[PDB]
Amino acid sequence: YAIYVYKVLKQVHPDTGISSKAMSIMNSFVNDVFERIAGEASRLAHYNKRSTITSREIQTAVRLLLPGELAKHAVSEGTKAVTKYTSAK
Template identity: 80%
Template sequence: MAPKAEKKPSTAEEDQQQEEKKLSSPAPSPAEKKPAKAEKRLPAVTKEGSGLIEKKKKKMKKINETYKIYIFKVLKQVHPDIGISSKAMGIMNSFINDIFEKLAQESSRLARYNKKPTITSREIQTSVRLVLPGELAKHAVSEGVYGYENNRVINEVRI
């Protein structure tokens, strides 16, 4: 372990300069040392030449996930010559979000009823039958089973 450095005896001039520094800048009170975390801060303002320039904080861009791209792709597969307005696209996006939310709630409820911790494809299939009406449920289940089997076969080939 290294020995501690010894303090040099200070001269009277150095002591006087230190006291003047202390007197010229008053010690901030404890409340002024740290600003409260909830305190709102104004943007920094700097003087450049004759005018004032404000520094602005960059805003974080909120990531907004939608199904608009996929809705448009399906529309072009079914009716290539038809377009869709932005208002109608917003309505379709809300519709898909609502359906997915209903399916998730129903699947969760089924898993809870059966005291299972995991939502499997069986719960999803049953919730589709319960949420969607008649013929629409039959088509959705058949397409879902086809997609599930197709995905399973592809994953088995990789292994």
């Protein structure tokens, strides 16, 4: 996600760069968070005995993984993305 991480770095810090090692750490962070969330959503599916992982399992998986406030925004940005996505046709 090197490039996708660099773009975000410019949206928050246009005049700020990043080293190679720092990037490697960010890449691990993304993959780590991904597996965690996806891991939960996976369980939620099996628990409720469903053969699909929708944005619903992902959302709750965020409330269980991410802490209070931090999870809140995640739910906001996620819900918004899905809302806008469906709109674009």
